């Protein structure tokens, strides 16, 4: 049928999972560090360590989601 092709392209839009499979390691690093280290830190401290961690990720070059929310990622 004609609708089968329209869903063909929609099922072939797996490029979103393809790009998601590139920043999983960095996001998991950030989430694990948030879970372990940041238990005892305040908001200013947490933000400072988040920016430190993101700069470190940039210096070592591993993909991570720029629009990252720790609450929404878990």
């Amino acid at each position: 049928k004609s609708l089968t092709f329209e869903k063909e392209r929609w099922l072939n839009t797996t490029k979103q999972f393809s790009k998601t499979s590139q920043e999983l390691i960095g996001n998991c690093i950030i989430s694990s560090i948030y879970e372990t280290y940041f238990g005892h830190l305040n908001e200013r401290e947490r933000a400072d360590m988040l920016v430190i961690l993101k700069r470190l990720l940039g210096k070592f070059a591993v993909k991570y989601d720029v629009n990252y929310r720790f609450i929404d990622y878990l």
């Binding site: 049928k1 609708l3 329209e6 869903k7 929609w10």
Partner: protein
């Protein structure tokens, strides 16, 4: 609290849009898994042969709805993150104000201040819809000036006259350091140094650029110190309760 009071519409829009996006994603996933199960069938039943053909046209419509709503989301969230800058600068000023109030509080046992009083005052400035005042440009500058006036008129009364003038001068300088140019800050800093005697700067004046500082030089060079001190309260445009 400030973003809620100033524009809660964008808040409720954000929560409802996020919730609706999640609901649409999950229900489209349900439709997709149903379609996969029917595809596993050789031809399917009447609900599968032609009924889910039109239901799958509805699936096209659902995908279009999700696309347009995520387009709306990508149009709206960046605007939200763009306009949080004004509230950010409000917080930048407020944290300095709170630190200054704590600095006063640690000097004498009576001058203390808790977080709750500051939050109540910040709720009040918004609750109090002032009459037509000076055109303080956009909303953020106006509400910052209102916040300074309210924190004064609320937390001035807890201080004696000397600490009243100290806090008035410090808060006026704190406001004008950021809201005005660097020349304004340098002139007021050196003039305050002139007011002090242990440490002092160079007596300096600027002509036809900062008009109030002309009155300040007139006051100081006449050795009328009380007028120089109360100038800050006079031009800070508040009434001592």
């Amino acid at each position: 609290i400030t973003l809620t009071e100033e524009n809660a519409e964008m808040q409720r829009k954000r929560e409802d849009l996020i919730k609706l996006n999640t609901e649409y994603k999950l229900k489209l996933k349900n439709l997709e898994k149903r379609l996969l199960e029917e595809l596993n069938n050789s031809q399917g039943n009447m609900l599968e042969n032609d009924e889910l053909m039109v239901t799958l046209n509805n699936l096209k419509k659902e995908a279009m709805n999700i696309e347009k709503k995520l387009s709306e989301s990508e149009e709206f969230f960046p605007q939200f993150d763009n306009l949080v800058e004004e509230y950010s600068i409000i917080g930048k000023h407020s944290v300095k104000i709170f630190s200054m109030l704590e600095k006063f509080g640690q000097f004498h046992w009576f001058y203390g201040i808790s977080i709750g009083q500051f939050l109540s005052c910040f709720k009040r400035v918004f609750i109090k819809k002032s009459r037509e005042t000076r055109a303080a440009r956009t909303r953020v500058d106006e509400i910052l000036w209102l916040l300074y006036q309210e924190v004064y008129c609320q937390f001035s009364t807890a201080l004696d006259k000397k600490f009243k003038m100290i806090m008035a001068m410090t808060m006026f300088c704190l406001y004008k350091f950021d809201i005005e140019s660097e020349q304004y800050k340098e002139a007021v800093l050196t003039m305050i140094g002139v007011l002090s005697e242990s440490s002092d700067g160079v007596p300096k004046l600027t002509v036809d650029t900062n008009n109030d500082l002309r009155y300040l030089w007139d006051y100081v060079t006449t050795k009328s110190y009380i007028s120089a001190l109360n100038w800050f309260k006079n031009e800070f445009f508040v009434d001592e309760w």
